[PDB]
Every structure is written in structure tokens, then in C-alpha cells.
Amino acid sequence: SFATRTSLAADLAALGLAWGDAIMVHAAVSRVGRLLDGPDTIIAALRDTVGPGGTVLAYADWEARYEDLVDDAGRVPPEWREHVPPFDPQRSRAIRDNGVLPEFLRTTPGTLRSGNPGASLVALGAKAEWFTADHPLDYGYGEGSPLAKLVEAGGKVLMLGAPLDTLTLLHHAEHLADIPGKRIKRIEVPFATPTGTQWRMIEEFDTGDPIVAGLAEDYFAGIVTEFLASGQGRQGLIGAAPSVLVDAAAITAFGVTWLEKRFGT
Amino acid sequence: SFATRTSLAADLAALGLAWGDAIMVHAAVSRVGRLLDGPDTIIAALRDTVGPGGTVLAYADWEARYEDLVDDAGRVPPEWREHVPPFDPQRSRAIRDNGVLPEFLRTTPGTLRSGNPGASLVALGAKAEWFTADHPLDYGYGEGSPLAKLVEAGGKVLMLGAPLDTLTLLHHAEHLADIPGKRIKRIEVPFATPTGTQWRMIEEFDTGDPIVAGLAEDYFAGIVTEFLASGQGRQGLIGAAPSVLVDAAAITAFGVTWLEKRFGTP
Ligand SMILES: CC(C)(COP(=O)(O)OP(=O)(O)OC[C@H]1O[C@@H](n2cnc3c(N)ncnc32)[C@H](O)[C@@H]1OP(=O)(O)O)[C@@H](O)C(=O)NCCC(=O)NCCS
Ligand SMILES: CC(C)(COP(=O)(O)OP(=O)(O)OC[C@H]1O[C@@H](n2cnc3c(N)ncnc32)[C@H](O)[C@@H]1OP(=O)(O)O)[C@@H](O)C(=O)NCCC(=O)NCCS
Ligand SMILES: NC[C@@H]1O[C@H](O[C@H]2[C@@H](O)[C@H](O[C@@H]3[C@@H](O)[C@H](N)C[C@H](N)[C@H]3O[C@H]3O[C@H](CN)[C@@H](O)[C@H](O)[C@H]3N)O[C@@H]2CO)[C@H](N)[C@@H](O)[C@@H]1O
Ligand SMILES: NC[C@@H]1O[C@H](O[C@H]2[C@@H](O)[C@H](O[C@@H]3[C@@H](O)[C@H](N)C[C@H](N)[C@H]3O[C@H]3O[C@H](CN)[C@@H](O)[C@H](O)[C@H]3N)O[C@@H]2CO)[C@H](N)[C@@H](O)[C@@H]1O
């Protein structure tokens, strides 16, 4: 009853994961079953399937609970400024909400982490250095982001037992969509620097809620569901977890058209 | 209401943690309260209290589920041998049973991890290399082990909200105790090599149960309780967690004498 890196790789190949793919994974490890090496079995299986020319990616985000202390302009009060732990791409943990896997991937020797804290991705493999390079600090889900590079690279996204609304790539569709009423987030971010802490104001479309009013919180799952229903994407089991595999460029264009059809002109 | 690295260091100083100390920590991080930097707040506070001359240590162990497959001699079935992930001191996770802190410390840049998988410790600070170097693979809780070095260096053990029965150092007292009937655990451990997996049999006194028959599972808690009752050690709050701080040499000698009184003949 032990799932192994060999058995999971066979499940991944049957689902459609291909040699040389850049694969981004959102996993609910508790639904995969008994794993011989725990969550690292999934990372090893993904690397075995894509090979040294492929890349394994996950959404890291940043564990930064100082967000509760900020005012309405997103500023940290001066009495708290020197206590907020600054962002270090090599030492800052991945956010706990994303699950154990993004942190397990981040601490795998050889994995790189991009510089935009809230929008940061981890990448391990051939194009990891390119995926994590030059992440724009403002609107880090847009044109120069790792998510845009995932579309650029013809990559794929694997929902490994995770609820479909956790597909981070659809925030990149939210960014691109020509629709009105886009919600905006502004927050002060501390950055670790060799000379001390450097504060910077960050502006981006708010990803803590749907980009526009009139949408349910988990509305991403409805887009993925309709994307599967249109005959695109693949569904199957990875271990014991019902999983979904989608093409990054196709789902992004679907999401952009989905938003621009319902909202705006 | 956010526990911070400055506030936790103040709690640690009030408990007795001193500049330059080598401190081994057993933590129940959920009891510390709301932390501004999560579990890393505790690690940063410990480093701030001991300073650059001090060292922060935790019991890492090893997350290795293949023990369920072993036969009656502790041997791995041949059809499973090449599938068991081998031990890598830099890549093998800390065991999940020990809590989030040992894994967070292990993955902090600057931390080293010793080579005995089941008994491995992590160390961060001045003596991290000395604490984790040349960990004997057999009887990895005895002579020349990181636990013996913690005693050698006059280090301390911090129970940060953790149950007193998780004090790993008392396994070093179990090893040293001159008592009969000591149970021995022997199991196959895979070691990572460039050429594949290298299997080795590991022999040690069994630390999954009391060293001798007739003892309760949490009997370590009884030793610390009696150790505190004798007027030794310090008690206090670290954040919101009731904590205990003890001298590594004192608790070890207390534990050895405790076992040699109940069991063993002069
Ligand atoms: C939130 C979410 C992760 C919860 O699902 P989950 O399976 O319960 O959480 P995890 O993915 O961390 O998997 C937990 C399993 O991993 C294993 N695990 C967790 N920590 C472990 C550790 N230190 N050591 C070994 N194994 C561990 C365990 O098997 C655990 O199962 P258990 O708690 O039942 O014993 C999932 O619903 C989800 O949304 N995933 C997508 C995340 C994402 O990418 N989000 C983007 C922003 S929304
Ligand atoms: C078993 C034991 C760890 C359980 O105590 P615990 O506090 O509930 O578990 P942890 O120490 O891992 O800390 C949990 C807290 O850490 C935080 N945490 C856990 N994972 C986190 C993550 N990825 N990111 C940020 N914070 C995290 C959370 O605050 C979590 O609280 P929550 O799970 O209620 O939300 C504790 O009782 C114990 O025995 N500690 C000593 C273990 C030891 O060293 N044993 C050696 C021989 S037995
Ligand atoms: N949900 C209501 C809103 O939540 C905000 O905080 C939210 C925010 O920190 C964080 O949101 C994070 C963002 O950061 C990150 N950049 C992308 C990520 N997908 C998103 O995640 C959130 O949206 C997903 C749906 N795609 C959900 O699956 C997920 O459970 C949820 N945490 O989770 C918190 C709660 O979801 C604010 N508190 C406030 O704007 C309002 O309360
Ligand atoms: N206790 C009963 C026995 O437990 C064994 O497994 C045990 C073993 O793998 C493992 O034991 C681990 C050892 O590894 C490790 N080298 C030191 C560590 N202190 C110890 O931990 C154990 O003993 C502590 C008390 N010091 C307890 O606080 C802790 O809850 C317990 N997990 O946890 C399991 C539960 O203790 C066997 N299943 C079987 O021989 C029998 O059931």
C-alpha cells in the first residue's frame, strides 16, 4: 500500500506529464496515500518523469504575518518596523497555506526562489534559474513574472488532489484580463539587504479575493471545471488523489476570455 | 500579541539562558503563542540570547517509513531494497514526530546535521561542526556522540513547552548506565552513495522503549520531575509555553544514578 517514486511517476506519465515539461504542481499530499518518502516522493517522481531538461515548480508565497499590523495605506507602524522579519529569498519560508510541498520543494538542495515575496515561485530543474530571475516587484503576477514564463515555456499545471481554486496561474489570467473594477493591493514589504532592512511599497492586483466584484471566492474552480468540460485538460489518479493536468498557455487564455466575456467589453 | 524574537529572547534570558551557551531545544511550538516569524522566531531568539559564541541544537532523527517493511531480523525485503530512499544528511528530512522546529532549524542556512540517521542532531552556531562531526553509526547515543559532546561542552537542554519525556539526552544516560538487561535495537539503514544505496546494519540500545523492562513509557518525565524536585534546573515561561531549562551534565549524571539505583548491582 506504499506509493513510491516509481509508481507515482507511472501515474504521472499516464496522466500526460511529458519528458522535458515545465510542471507546476498544487498538491494536497494527504489525499495521495501512504508515501514511502513522504512529500519528497512526489517531487522525486515529478523529476523522474520530466527528466533533467524539465523543471518542477510550486507557488511559494511568503509567511509574513506582519500584514495584520498595517494601516489602510499598507504602511507598517514605526513602532513595529524594526521587528518585522525581512524577506530573504533563500531563508524565508513558503506560506503555510500552500501546503507542505512548496516548502519541501523550496528546501530541496538546488531549488531556486524568485524575488517577489508574495508572488514568489520555487523552481528545480533545467530552467530554474530563468524561472526565478528578474521577478518584477510590482504586479508580480503579470508580464515579467514566472507565471508568464510558465506560459512562455509551454508548461503545464498539475492539481494533485488540491481544490481547483488554488491554481495560482489563474491570477496571471486575472492580471491580463481587460475588465473594469480590478481590485488593487498596496503593502509595504521589508527586504533583507547586506546593509540592513530596505522597505518598499508594493502595488499589485489583489489576489486575496476575486479580482472584481460579483465573483465567489473559489470561482477559479469553476473556470477549471469549464475548461475540462470543453474537452481540454486531462484527469486521472496520481496515487490515490484525483488529479487534473492542464496546459498553462491554454488555461490562461481560457481564463482571460472567461473574465472578458462576463465582465468588461 | 505577536511573540517576537526580542520578546522571546527576553523570556529566554529570564529563564537562565546565557551568552555563549550551547542550548539543545525540545519545543512544542503551538504552545508558544502567536509568533511574528512563525517557528523561526524561536530559532532567532535562541541565537540572539546565546550570541555568536553559542550554539543552538535540536534532535533531528530521520523520516524513514521503511521500518514497517523489515522482517524479524530488521532486514529489508529484497524486492524493496532499491526503492527505499537512502539517508542523505543534507537532504533527508527531520522526523515529523519531533515537531516543526528541528526541520526548520535543519533547513536554516548555516546548520549542520550529523551522520547517524536515527540519532542525528542539528547544530547552528560556533561549535556546529564539532557537535555534528564523526557521529558514530553504532551506539549513536553513547561515546563520541553529539549528546556526549553537549555534556562535554557544559551545554543545556531547553524544554520549550514540550513534554518532559521527549528529553533525548536521557537516552545518553540510558547508554551510560551500568545496569543489566539493556535492550538493543538492530535495523538496516540505507546510506546514499554516488553508486547507489549502501546498506549497513546499525546497532544501538533501543530508544523506542525504556532501555530495560519494567519501566513506564514516560519514565523520563519522572527523572526530570525528581531532578527539578532536588533543587536543580529552572522553570519559567517562554512566550506562552511553560518551559524547563536544565544543565546537560547535571541531568545526565542524575539520570545515570537514577537507573543505577533502581536496577543494577554494586
Ligand atoms: C491547503 C491544502 C494544502 C490542504 O491539503 P492537505 O493535503 O491537507 O495539506 P498538505 O498538502 O500539506 O499535505 C498534508 C500531508 O502531507 C504530509 N506531511 C505534512 N507535513 C509533513 C512532514 N513534516 N513530514 C512528513 N510528512 C508531512 C503528511 O502526510 C500530511 O498528511 P496528514 O496531515 O493527514 O498526516 C490543499 O487543500 C491545497 O489547497 N493545495 C494547493 C496549495 C497551493 O498551491 N495554493 C496556492 C495559493 S491558494
Ligand atoms: C509532538 C510535539 C511536537 C507536538 O507539539 P506541537 O506544538 O503541537 O507541534 P509543533 O512543535 O510541530 O508546532 C506546531 C506549531 O508550529 C507552527 N507551524 C507548524 N508548521 C508551520 C509552518 N509550515 N509554517 C509556519 N508555522 C508552522 C504552527 O504554529 C503550529 O501550530 P498548529 O499546528 O496548531 O497550527 C510536542 O509535544 C513535542 O513532543 N516536542 C518535542 C519533540 C522531540 O524533540 N522529541 C524527541 C524524542 S520524542
Ligand atoms: N478571502 C477574503 C479576503 O482574504 C484576504 O487574505 C487572504 C490572502 O492573505 C490570502 O490570499 C492568497 C494571496 O495572498 C495569494 N497571493 C494568492 C492565493 N491564491 C490567495 O489564497 C486565497 O485565495 C485562493 C483562491 N484563489 C484560496 O484557494 C486560498 O484558500 C486563499 N488563501 O488568503 C487570505 C484569505 O483567503 C484578506 N484578509 C482580505 O482581502 C479578505 O479577508
Ligand atoms: N513505545 C513502544 C514501542 O515503540 C517503538 O516505536 C517507537 C520508535 O520508533 C520511536 O521511538 C523514538 C526513537 O526512534 C528515537 N530514537 C528516540 C525517541 N525518544 C523515541 O520517541 C518515542 O519515545 C519518547 C520517549 N522517550 C516519546 O516521547 C515519543 O512519543 C516516542 N515517539 O516512536 C515509536 C513510539 O515510541 C516500536 N513501535 C515498538 O518497539 C513499541 O511499540
XYZ file of N, CA, C and O and ligand atoms in Angstrom, chain A residues 24-31 33 35 37-39 58-59 61 95-102 104 159-163 165-168 171, chain B residues 63 65 93-96 99-100 103, ligand 1:
224
model
N 4.193 22.827 -12.989
C 3.840 23.478 -11.735
C 2.780 22.635 -11.039
O 1.794 22.237 -11.666
N 2.984 22.355 -9.756
C 2.149 21.409 -9.026
C 1.492 22.117 -7.848
O 2.144 22.890 -7.135
N 0.191 21.879 -7.674
C -0.552 22.235 -6.469
C -1.064 20.930 -5.879
O -1.914 20.265 -6.481
N -0.559 20.561 -4.707
C -0.778 19.228 -4.171
C -1.479 19.283 -2.822
O -1.214 20.167 -2.003
N -2.368 18.320 -2.603
C -2.929 18.010 -1.293
C -2.352 16.650 -0.909
O -2.924 15.605 -1.226
N -1.187 16.670 -0.255
C -0.408 15.447 -0.070
C -1.180 14.409 0.737
O -0.993 13.202 0.544
N -2.088 14.848 1.612
C -2.861 13.915 2.429
C -3.788 13.020 1.609
O -4.196 11.963 2.101
N -4.140 13.418 0.387
C -5.010 12.612 -0.461
C -4.252 11.650 -1.366
O -4.886 10.844 -2.055
N -2.141 9.265 -0.447
C -1.986 7.961 0.157
C -0.680 7.852 0.920
O 0.026 8.835 1.164
N 2.986 7.383 1.433
C 4.157 7.635 0.599
C 5.405 7.131 1.311
O 5.565 7.339 2.518
N 8.616 7.986 0.949
C 9.489 9.075 1.365
C 8.695 10.349 1.641
O 9.214 11.457 1.488
N 7.429 10.201 2.025
C 6.587 11.334 2.323
C 6.406 12.248 1.129
O 6.379 11.803 -0.023
N 6.272 13.551 1.387
C 6.091 14.506 0.281
C 7.247 14.535 -0.708
O 7.034 14.910 -1.867
N 6.549 25.262 -7.908
C 5.458 25.365 -6.953
C 5.328 26.818 -6.525
O 6.280 27.596 -6.612
N 4.126 27.185 -6.085
C 3.874 28.534 -5.594
C 4.319 28.623 -4.138
O 3.771 27.932 -3.274
N 4.932 31.777 -2.193
C 4.379 32.901 -1.431
C 5.366 33.218 -0.307
O 6.566 32.935 -0.421
N 4.641 30.057 2.286
C 3.465 30.258 3.121
C 2.862 28.905 3.479
O 2.866 27.963 2.675
N 2.377 28.793 4.717
C 1.854 27.519 5.199
C 0.568 27.128 4.488
O 0.282 25.934 4.337
N -0.207 28.114 4.031
C -1.480 27.821 3.384
C -1.298 26.969 2.134
O -2.176 26.170 1.794
N -0.162 27.110 1.449
C 0.065 26.394 0.198
C 0.378 24.920 0.401
O 0.511 24.193 -0.588
N 0.526 24.470 1.638
C 0.768 23.073 1.913
C 2.235 22.792 2.170
O 3.110 23.653 2.046
N 2.490 21.540 2.544
C 3.843 21.122 2.883
C 4.739 21.087 1.646
O 5.943 21.358 1.742
N 4.177 20.775 0.474
C 5.005 20.532 -0.708
C 5.811 21.747 -1.153
O 7.021 21.594 -1.400
N 5.236 22.951 -1.298
C 6.069 24.085 -1.736
C 7.250 24.351 -0.818
O 8.324 24.739 -1.294
N 8.706 21.942 1.101
C 9.606 20.813 0.894
C 10.401 20.981 -0.392
O 11.591 20.652 -0.444
N -2.849 19.732 -10.731
C -3.610 19.822 -9.487
C -3.622 18.429 -8.875
O -4.427 17.581 -9.258
N -2.717 18.187 -7.928
C -2.550 16.854 -7.349
C -3.418 16.755 -6.098
O -2.967 16.935 -4.964
N -4.697 16.452 -6.319
C -5.658 16.322 -5.244
C -6.076 17.615 -4.583
O -6.924 17.582 -3.683
N -5.523 18.748 -5.000
C -5.828 20.037 -4.408
C -7.129 20.594 -4.981
O -7.473 20.318 -6.134
N -7.871 21.372 -4.190
C -9.050 22.052 -4.737
C -8.657 22.921 -5.922
O -7.615 23.581 -5.917
N -9.549 25.670 -7.068
C -9.457 27.119 -6.912
C -8.078 27.592 -6.462
O -7.865 28.807 -6.368
N -7.142 26.687 -6.193
C -5.797 27.054 -5.767
C -4.821 27.180 -6.931
O -3.611 27.278 -6.701
N -5.315 27.171 -8.165
C -4.482 27.291 -9.360
C -3.933 28.711 -9.452
O -4.619 29.626 -9.907
N -2.678 28.898 -9.028
C -2.099 30.240 -8.971
C -2.017 30.888 -10.346
O -2.121 32.115 -10.461
N -4.355 33.698 -11.444
C -4.111 35.088 -11.071
C -3.397 35.834 -12.186
O -3.583 37.046 -12.345
N 13.159 10.885 9.023
C 11.864 10.454 8.490
C 12.084 9.310 7.507
O 12.411 9.537 6.339
N 10.086 5.783 6.697
C 8.941 4.906 6.886
C 9.198 3.452 6.498
O 8.316 2.619 6.728
N 14.853 14.564 5.482
C 14.097 15.410 6.388
C 14.316 14.977 7.832
O 14.709 13.843 8.119
N 14.051 15.905 8.746
C 13.930 15.547 10.147
C 12.624 14.796 10.355
O 11.658 14.979 9.610
N 12.602 13.924 11.363
C 11.410 13.120 11.591
C 10.253 14.027 11.980
O 10.425 15.040 12.669
N 9.062 13.688 11.487
C 7.894 14.524 11.731
C 7.469 14.484 13.194
O 6.925 15.470 13.708
N 8.457 17.392 15.646
C 7.877 18.713 15.535
C 8.480 19.522 14.400
O 9.435 19.120 13.731
N 7.888 20.701 14.196
C 8.295 21.576 13.102
C 9.682 22.172 13.336
O 10.425 22.414 12.376
N 13.058 20.508 11.889
C 13.164 20.625 10.438
C 13.417 22.070 10.021
O 14.154 22.326 9.061
C -4.439 23.646 1.713
C -4.086 22.243 1.277
C -2.606 22.115 1.133
C -4.552 21.254 2.338
O -4.385 19.946 1.813
P -3.557 18.876 2.752
O -3.290 17.612 1.971
O -4.380 18.546 3.987
O -2.103 19.605 3.242
P -0.625 19.143 2.659
O -0.557 19.396 1.185
O 0.475 19.892 3.360
O -0.465 17.527 2.936
C -0.544 17.070 4.257
C 0.179 15.742 4.265
O 1.433 15.917 3.926
C 2.346 15.005 4.944
N 3.167 15.861 5.763
C 2.900 17.090 6.224
N 3.949 17.504 6.941
C 4.878 16.526 6.920
C 6.153 16.430 7.498
N 6.865 17.369 8.303
N 6.883 15.338 7.326
C 6.392 14.303 6.587
N 5.149 14.392 6.022
C 4.398 15.515 6.198
C 1.502 14.298 5.673
O 1.243 13.053 5.007
C 0.195 15.129 5.701
O -0.878 14.338 5.817
P -1.694 14.244 7.303
O -1.751 15.641 7.964
O -3.097 13.721 7.076
O -0.953 13.270 8.194
C -4.793 21.890 -0.049
O -6.146 21.933 0.159
C -4.401 22.917 -1.155
O -5.089 23.913 -1.332
N -3.171 22.680 -2.020
C -2.776 23.689 -3.095
C -1.888 24.723 -2.392
C -1.489 25.904 -3.302
O -0.663 25.769 -4.157
N -2.114 27.155 -3.075
C -1.789 28.327 -3.880
C -2.367 29.565 -3.120
S -4.163 29.268 -2.820
